[PDB]
Symmetry: C3
Subunit: 149 residues, 3 copies
Amino acid sequence: AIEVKLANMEAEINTLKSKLELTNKLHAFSMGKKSGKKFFVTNHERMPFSKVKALCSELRGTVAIPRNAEENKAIQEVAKTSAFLGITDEVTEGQFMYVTGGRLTYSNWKKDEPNDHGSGEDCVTIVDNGLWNDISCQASHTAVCEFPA
Amino acid sequence: AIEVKLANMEAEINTLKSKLELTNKLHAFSMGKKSGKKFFVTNHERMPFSKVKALCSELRGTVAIPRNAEENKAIQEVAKTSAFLGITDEVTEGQFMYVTGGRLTYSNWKKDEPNDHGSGEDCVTIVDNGLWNDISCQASHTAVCEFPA
Amino acid sequence: AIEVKLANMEAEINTLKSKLELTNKLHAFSMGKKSGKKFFVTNHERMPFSKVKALCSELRGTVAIPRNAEENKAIQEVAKTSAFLGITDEVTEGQFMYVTGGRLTYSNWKKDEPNDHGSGEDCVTIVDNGLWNDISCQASHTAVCEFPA
Ligand SMILES: CC(=O)N[C@@H]1[C@@H](O)[C@H](O)[C@@H](CO)O[C@@H]1O
Ligand SMILES: CC(=O)N[C@@H]1[C@@H](O)[C@H](O)[C@@H](CO)O[C@@H]1O
Ligand SMILES: CC(=O)N[C@@H]1[C@@H](O)[C@H](O)[C@@H](CO)O[C@@H]1O
Ligand SMILES: [Ca+2]
Ligand SMILES: [Ca+2]
Ligand SMILES: [Ca+2]
Ligand SMILES: [Ca+2]
Ligand SMILES: [Ca+2]
Ligand SMILES: [Ca+2]
Ligand SMILES: [Ca+2]
Ligand SMILES: [Ca+2]
Ligand SMILES: [Ca+2]
Ligand SMILES: [Cl-]
Ligand SMILES: [Cl-]
Ligand SMILES: [Cl-]
C-alpha cells in the first residue's frame, strides 16, 4: 500500500503539473500571446508606479519594458492610454535604468524629454503616440505587466 | 527514503497550490479585475434567472449584485445588455432581497419601477443607462457573475 | 504517522484537481463559451495551416470547425479576419474531410469555390461575410481553435 500510493501520488502530481502548464498556455493564447513574443497584459487600472511594480511582482511578471520599436508599439496597443514603463532614474537623476537592471538601450523619448519637470520626474510613461515622457512616480497611469516570450 | 519522498511531495503540492492561485490572479487581472474591487464577468449568454444562479454557483461565484453606484456601473459595462442581478422579492412583494441574504440597500430603479407588471415580476435586470427593472424570473437575460474583491 | 500524511496528501491533490477544473470552467466562461456549446479562441496570430494544427493540438483542441450556421457565425466573430478551418482535401483531392475525421457535411462556400486554384488548394479559410474559400495550406491565416462543448 504505502509505497504504491506514494508512487501513484507522484504520478498524480506530475499529471496536475502538466494540466496547469496547459491551462497557462491556453490562457496566454486567449490573452493574445504571439509565438516567440513576450506578452503584455493590463486590467486597465491606473495607479502609482510603486503599485504597478507590486502588482506585476505578485503576478510574477514585471512592469512593461519595450526593448525595441516593435515591443514599444505592442505596449502602446495594450495600454490604449498613458502607461508606466519599467524604467526610472530614481537611483541617479538623469540616468534611466530598467527596473530589471541596466542602462537603457532603446528609447523613444518625446522631444526635450526626459526633463525632470518641476518638482521632479523619475518615472516614465509611454503616451498615446508611442513616444515617452518622464513623469512623477506618484502620478496614476495604466498598469501594464510583462511576461516572457 | 519514504519520509523524505513524502516531505518532498508535500513541498511540490504547496508549490502547485501557489502556482494555481497565481493563475487565478493573472486571469482576473487580464479580464479587468481592479484592485480591491469585486470581479465581474460574463460569457454574454442570456438565460432564465434559475440558470444564471446555477451557473455562477457552479463557478463558485454568485449572480452580480451592485452594492453602490460604482459597482452598478462596473456591472453595466461588463454586461453591455439587460442582465439579471442577484436580487428578488419572491418572499415579500416589494421587499427585494439579495440572493446571498439581507435587505436591499442601494437601488437604481427606472421610472415606474418596480411595478411587478402583468402576472408578476420578482427578479431584477440592469438595463439601459444602468437603470433597474423588475422582470419575470422566467425571462432570459445576460448572465453576469461576481467574484470577491 | 506516515499513513495520516499520505491520506492528507490524497485530499490535497483531490482538492487541487477540483479547483483546477473550476479555474478551467471560469476561463472558458470568461472567453465566451455558451452552455452546451463548444467555444472558439484565437490569439489573432496568422500562420501556415500545419502550425495552427500543431498549436490547437497542443492545447487539446483542434482547428475551428463550423458544423452549422451558428458555429460559423461564432467563428467569424472570433476570427475578425480570414482564418483556417479544420477542413481539408489533402488526402483525396476534391473530398474535403474534417481534420478529426469524416466527410464534410455542412458547408458555406463562396460562389465558385472550392476550386483547387492554380498549383492547388487543399486547405480552407472562413473569409468575407463568413463564406469559405479553399486556399494553400502554406498560406498564413488566423489561428482559431475550438474546444469541446
Ligand atoms: C505633470 C505633467 O503632465 N507634466 C508634463 C511634463 O512631464 C512634460 O515634460 C512637460 C512638457 O512640456 O509637460 C508637462 O509639464
Ligand atoms: C413602463 C412599463 O410599463 N414598463 C413595463 C415593464 O415594467 C415590464 O417589466 C415590461 C415587461 O416586458 O413591460 C413594460 O416594459
Ligand atoms: C474566383 C477565383 O478564381 N478566385 C481565386 C480563389 O479561388 C483562390 O483561392 C485565390 C488564391 O490566391 O485566387 C483567386 O482569388
Ligand atoms: Ca530624481
Ligand atoms: Ca528624473
Ligand atoms: Ca517630463
Ligand atoms: Ca411577488
Ligand atoms: Ca415582485
Ligand atoms: Ca417591471
Ligand atoms: Ca490536392
Ligand atoms: Ca484541393
Ligand atoms: Ca479557392
Ligand atoms: Cl518622481
Ligand atoms: Cl418572477
Ligand atoms: Cl495546399
